[PDB]
Amino acid sequence: APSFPFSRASGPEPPAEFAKLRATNPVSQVKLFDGSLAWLVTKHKDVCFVATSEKLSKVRTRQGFPELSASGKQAAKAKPTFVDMDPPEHMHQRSMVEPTFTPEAVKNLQPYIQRTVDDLLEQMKQKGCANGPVDLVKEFALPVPSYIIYTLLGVPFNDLEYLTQQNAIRTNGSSTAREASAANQELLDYLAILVEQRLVEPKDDIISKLCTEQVKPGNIDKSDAVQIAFLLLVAGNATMVNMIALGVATLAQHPDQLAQLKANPSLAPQFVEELCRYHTASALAIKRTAKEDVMIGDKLVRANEGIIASNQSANRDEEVFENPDEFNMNRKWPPQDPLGFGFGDHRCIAEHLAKAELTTVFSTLYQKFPDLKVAVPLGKINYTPLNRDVGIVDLPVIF
Numbered sequence: 001a002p003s004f005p006f007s008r009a010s011g012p013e014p015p016a017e018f019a020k021l022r023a024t025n026p027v028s029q030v031k032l033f034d035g036s037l038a039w040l041v042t043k044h045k046d047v048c049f050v051a052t053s054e055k056l057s058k059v060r061t062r063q064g065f066p067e068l069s070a071s072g073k074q075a076a077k078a079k080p081t082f083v084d085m086d087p088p089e090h091m092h093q094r095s096m097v098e099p100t101f102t103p104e105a106v107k108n109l110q111p112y113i114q115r116t117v118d119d120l121l122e123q124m125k126q127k128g129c130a131n132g133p134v135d136l137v138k139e140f141a142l143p144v145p146s147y148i149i150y151t152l153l154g155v156p157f158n159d160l161e162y163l164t165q166q167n168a169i170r171t172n173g174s175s176t177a178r179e180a181s182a183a184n185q186e187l188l189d190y191l192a193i194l195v196e197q198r199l200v201e202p203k204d205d206i207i208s209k210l211c212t213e214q215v216k217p218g219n220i221d222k223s224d225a226v227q228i229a230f231l232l233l234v235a236g237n238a239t240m241v242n243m244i245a246l247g248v249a250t251l252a253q254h255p256d257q258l259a260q261l262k263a264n265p266s267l268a269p270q271f272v273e274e275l276c277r278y279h280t281a282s283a284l285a286i287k288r289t290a291k292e293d294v295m296i297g298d299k300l301v302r303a304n305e306g307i308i309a310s311n312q313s314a315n316r317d318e319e320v321f322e323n324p325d326e327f328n329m330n331r332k333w334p335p336q337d338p339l340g341f342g343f344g345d346h347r348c349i350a351e352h353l354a355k356a357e358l359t360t361v362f363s364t365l366y367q368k369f370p371d372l373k374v375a376v377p378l379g380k381i382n383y384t385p386l387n388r389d390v391g392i393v394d395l396p397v398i399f
């Protein structure tokens with residue numbers, strides 16, 4: 001039973017194990033860091049089954065849950081938020097915050113998303129690159145999602161830059177454990193004060209809605225409101241940053257795709273679709289324990305055994321996506337959904353928001369900067385460590 005998680009084959013590539021498994025061993029056991037086992041599911045049909053089966057649970061206090069690291073195991077001890085809940089608790093809590101994220105709400109947010117992107121691009125332009133390249137991550141990929149989610153939560157504008165930096169320290173590979181933990185607690189302490197403030201004087205933000213609609217009637221406590229807000233901040237932000245950077249790198253890697261997007265920015269939605277399939281930057285979230293025996297393919301998953309369903313592997317499944325290892329913005333899409341945002345009731349609350357942020361980026365960036373170029377050879381890009389989800393740490397650019 002091989003150790004899991006697997007390391008990526010190279011900076012921008014999935015782990016090499018998954019194609020082999022899809023071909024010869026699609027449902028198989030892997031060994032986790034603590035010596036426990038889990039079933040690894042690799043085919044799109046089977047990932048969808050795992051994501052939707054009511055015989056499977058996300059509750060992390062169930063013995064058999066596939067925690068992938070020592071830190072994951074300690075994190076499982078806390079009071080869960082909706083990410084780790086089953087029905088009916090899951091939607092009881094998730095419904096408290098899903099209004100901001102609906103397709104229609106995100107459509108109505110489009111002008112705000114556009115203005116945020118425009119403003120950050122203009123700051124980049126005013127800074128310029130006369131003295132050499134600038135880091136597209138720090139200057140752009142980081143602040144776009146950060147400013148948006150903090151603003152939606154209720155953070156005032158003058159606090160965005162500092163809080164963006166502190167949330168990045170949580171996940172920066174260069175942070176020490178103390179630095180990351182202190183940043184985590186700093187943000188929680190900040191959000192607690194915002195909850196206190198919005199309970200006394202609500203404003204038109206997510207924290208205020210939690211306060212008025214859930215804390216004041218006694219449906220949740222203040223501490224719960226803080227933890228729900230924190231989940232919305234930390235769940236997806238670093239993933240968004242990585243997706244922006246990976247999109248820029250991918251366009252540089254495939255010049256004719258960039259040429260097409262520059263000639264027709266209305267292709268941004270389809271570029272984003274392909275990006276979210278090809279670069280599955282959150283690949284380790286579709287995890288379960290079996291509450292009772294369940295058959296998956298030619299395997300029996302027994303009660304209290306763990307399951308990891310790779311959406312990354314599903315998104316490269318040749319039975320669903322023809323020529324899956326080719327990046328093609330002009331892909332002819334099958335009926336089956338790509339799984340970049342997961343599947344089933346737990347499917348990313350922010351899928352529509354994330355796609356709108358990415359579409360806005362990729363329909364704007366090369367209109368602003370038609371001569372944007374990565375300022376190092378592409379083979380020297382600084383990707384996330386290979387034992388992590390795919391991403392980019394920094395990306396020197398000129399324009």
Ligand code: HEM
Pocket residue numbers: 051082083084094145149231232233235236237239240243281282283285286311339340341342343344345346347348349350351353354355
């Ligand atoms: C391109 C960026 C993003 C990607 C690829 C992504 C991907 C995912 C994936 C794969 C899951 C797991 C879904 C499942 O369990 O099947 C998920 C869950 C979730 N995401 Fe995202 N996400 C992104 C951005 C965001 C943003 C911007 C936010 C917040 C504003 C967010 C908040 C969440 C939350 C709270 C959950 C848990 C949903 C639940 O379990 O009910 N995500 N996301």
